[PDB]
């Protein structure tokens, strides 16, 4: 049907603010946001892969795209989260 990130947004919200809710419009805005950043990152990764004549998008391409896309401290923290997640998943 119509997919959204609503349930995941809600889980994150409960982690960070147990006593805070969210309106329907705000959840819709969050979904728009997530889709936007998704498209940007996937597109940048696509160009990265083409420039280097590689046929596979790997986590390394994701990381480089993240470094291009996000400024400064946001980029560093994102890289930290990505690395921890890949390391925990791998084992």
């Amino acid at each position: 049907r119509k997919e959204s990130y609503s349930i995941y947004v809600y889980k994150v919200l409960k982690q960070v603010h147990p006593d805070t809710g969210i309106s329907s419009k705000a959840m819709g805005i969050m979904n728009s946001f997530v889709n936007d950043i998704f498209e940007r990152i996937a597109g940048e990764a696509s160009r990265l892969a083409h420039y280097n004549k590689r046929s596979t998008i790997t986590s390394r391409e994701i990381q480089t795209a993240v470094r291009l896309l996000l400024p400064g401290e946001l980029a560093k923290h994102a890289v930290s989260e990505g690395t921890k997640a890949v390391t925990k998943y791998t084992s």
Binding site: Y51, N52, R60, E61, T64
Partner: protein, 87 residues
């Protein structure tokens, strides 16, 4: 194994008459004395952003030499497409 002299104060190589000449191309007839430092700062910021992106591309390819194509892509993704340096 005979590296160049450590780079310092190179912002001063952007001389006063050079900035004046650039301003002439922009149609500026008279120039306040304080313009020069401001211009230097702006230029430095611009350069930082470009070089950062270029080097990121260079590292992704696991190369140690920044190429013209690296620069073209960096500029392109900032909406300042440059013609003349392809291939």
């Amino acid at each position: 194994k005979r590296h160049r002299k450590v780079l310092r104060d190179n912002i001063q190589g952007i001389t006063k008459p050079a900035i004046r000449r650039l301003a002439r191309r922009g149609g500026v007839k008279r120039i306040s004395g304080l313009i020069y430092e401001e211009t230097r700062g702006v230029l430095k910021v611009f350069l930082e952003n470009v070089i950062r992106d270029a080097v990121t591309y260079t590292e992704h390819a696991k190369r140690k030499t920044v190429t013209a194509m690296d620069v073209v892509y960096a500029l392109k993704r900032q909406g300042r497409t440059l013609y003349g340096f392809g291939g």
